[PDB]
Design a protein around this ligand. Structure first.
Ligand SMILES: CC[C@H](C)C(=O)O[C@H]1C[C@@H](C)C=C2C=C[C@H](C)[C@H](CC[C@@H](O)C[C@@H](O)CC(=O)O)[C@H]21
Lengths: 374, 371
């Protein structure tokens, strides 16, 4: 049960105590939050290079979230007010109608291998595709463990660019199935091993061998339904507010100046969760915003409509390159704890929670804005 | 002097002591880093809503950075390794050729005032532009203090969209000159005050009154020059590395899949600094990335070229909606300290440092990739 009545009135120590009893945490865990210094300097000096101390940010916990029926507590680390309050309130509303409904695709990541110096990029492309099974097998031969976990390279796609400032180039894509890992190193490794062969097949120089942060093959999705009776303020009817939100949505879907702000609101709830779990927040931002203008125009990541029942329905589909076996998510005592609070077992389970927070957050911001909030 | 030889080998305590002696910090300041709990729970419980403690991240300091002749220590808060080492190393190289050269525009921010319900958006638009001085004066009448500091509303631009899923709409833009502030609240306020009059002039419903995070009027710029003799590794000649970097740049300039990654590398150095100074990192990311595809194609934020002298030149121009009088930058003991280490006096001075870090960072990653 994620509903915490009068939680925003309890003192921090009482809130911790509560979450402690609720989740049945050990004292060793509660101590990590009740006492500054959870991250020892000896560990902190190992993550970054010229460490001189530590920087603190508030570690909150949103309430009311319900994902696919199960309740869950969402830990968020951020410095801006109203985010947790709005995420939580909006989550409260979604409850009556079934909470958030999520889904996701297999944890697929791209690995790009740039190849220059080819006089025949187009022919060369077909040479790679015919000896495709060969390359794939050479890639999986390296990361054997991964294959046992149920991951590994699954397919290859080659794209050519014949109109580049530095001549034509060929770009092969390794579509690797990482696993509960963000996939930066697993993918970058396969790209390095496969390189020698591709260079032999095509006859050109391999330049970059790196992953693409535009994980359009690793998407997380979320949905909500909000009844007009739920949004009814004092001077505004339930339906009049919905029309307001749709107006705001349409506005973002056509003007990039608003879209940027619209999408920032979304990340307002996603990033904090990512930082809380010790995940790279830059990778999610880059993938989120790069996906927004996939159709040649920077637009809305979410979508808001009114269904047959005159109910507000909203969606959010975006890349979620997140992980549980990552670098920092493992060494930071508090990050390990966040995952314990979340109760998530797969990276994708965590991704589904991240897009729900953001969807709730976008709705919260839009409601405030559409409610003539002066 | 920002050069710190053998800094990466010193213990944290000795690094802090050193930085302490260097900048001449008081013990009250050094204690904030040498001891956990700099941020008291009573303060931490006022920033956010359901606090239950604090989360810590490493607070490092990049070295060698030189901005317009003056040296500066850059504090960075992040969890990913090599960022600080790369930024520092790339800054070291930039030193020989003059360091980084920066500039910026006045701190201008947008305020959008969406208006719907008009049958004549196009005619309505001209009605606002004629009574434009009127609207601007009403806006500055609200924030008088700001006007005394040398900021305030400066102009107004109206844009129309007649092909929207929800009918035509008009969007007036307040081009406010915020000051040393991010401007979220200063702008949002003016937009609310001007709203009533616009609704009277045009005759439609005012919907959103909010700022735009795509601060394309508030740009920070940075430049570098890198000599082939400086990049010469063991098996790779200097010029062979440059060509490799240009190949990497071209690749990002044409393929969005690489561009996203290219730009992530950039924010890898900019965000840590932003978090360090207690600034909104989401706002900078949204503005950074949305600017990347201003020309209908998501591309590189930075540019890399080879000049007449066969030298590598790189640039970075992007929006930097940062502040010094913001909300958290004022209440967090360590954020206030970061600004003291930086030594910056204006928000734009800080913005010029952020783009230099990002530029250096992009170069560091690319050199690694092309090597
Ligand atoms: C080929 C290895 C890649 C470059 C890698 O992980 O290298 C590491 C370790 C070290 C070799 C040197 C490094 C130097 C600079 C960066 C801080 C980089 C990592 C940042 C990474 O997130 C950006 C890239 O993913 C995208 C891109 O922008 O190209 C780091």
């Amino acid at each position: 049960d994620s509903r915490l009545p009068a939680f925003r009135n309890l003192s921090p120590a009482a809130r911790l105590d509560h979450i402690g009893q609720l989740l049945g945490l050990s004292h060793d865990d509660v101590s990590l939050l009740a006492n500054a210094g959870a991250l020892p300097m000896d560990i902190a000096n190992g993550m970054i290079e010229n460490v001189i101390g530590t920087f603190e940010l508030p570690y909150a916990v949103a309430s009311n979230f319900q994902i696919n029926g199960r309740d869950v507590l969402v830990p968020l680390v951020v410095e801006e007010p109203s985010i947790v309050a709005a995420a939580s309130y909006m989550a409260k509303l979604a409850r009556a109608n079934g909470g958030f409904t999520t889904s996701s695709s297999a944890p697929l990541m791209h690995a790009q291998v740039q190849i220059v110096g080819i006089q025949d990029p187009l022919n060369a492309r077909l040479s790679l595709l015919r000896r495709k099974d060969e390359i794939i097998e050479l890639a999986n031969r390296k990361d054997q463990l991964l294959n046992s976990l149920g991951g590994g390279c699954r397919d290859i796609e080659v794209h050519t660019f014949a109109d580049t400032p530095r001549g034509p180039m060929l770009v092969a894509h390794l579509i690797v199935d990482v696993r509960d890992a963000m996939g930066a190193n697993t993918v970058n490794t396969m790209a390095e091993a496969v390189a020698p062969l591709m260079e032999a097949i095509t006859g050109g120089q391999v330049r970059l061998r790196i992953l693409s942060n535009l994980a359009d093959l690793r998407l997380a999705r979320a949905q909500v339904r909000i009844t007009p009776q739920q949004l009814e303020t004092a001077e505004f009817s339930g339906e009049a507010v919905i029309e307001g939100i749709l107006d705001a949505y349409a506005f973002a879907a056509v003007d990039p100046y608003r879209a940027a702000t619209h999408n920032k609101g979304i990340m307002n709830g996603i990033d904090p969760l990512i930082v809380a779990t010790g995940n790279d927040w830059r990778a999610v931002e880059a993938g989120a915003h790069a996906y927004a203008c996939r159709s040649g125009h920077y637009g809305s990541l979410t979508t808001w409509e009114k269904d047959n029942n005159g109910h507000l329905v909203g969606t959010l589909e975006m890349p979620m390159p997140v992980g549980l076996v990552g670098g920092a998510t493992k060494t930071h005592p508090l990050a390990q704890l966040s995952l314990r609070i979340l109760g998530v077992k797969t990276a994708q389970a965590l991704a589904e929670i991240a897009v729900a927070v953001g969807l709730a957050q976008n709705l919260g911001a839009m409601r405030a804005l559409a409610t003539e909030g002066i």
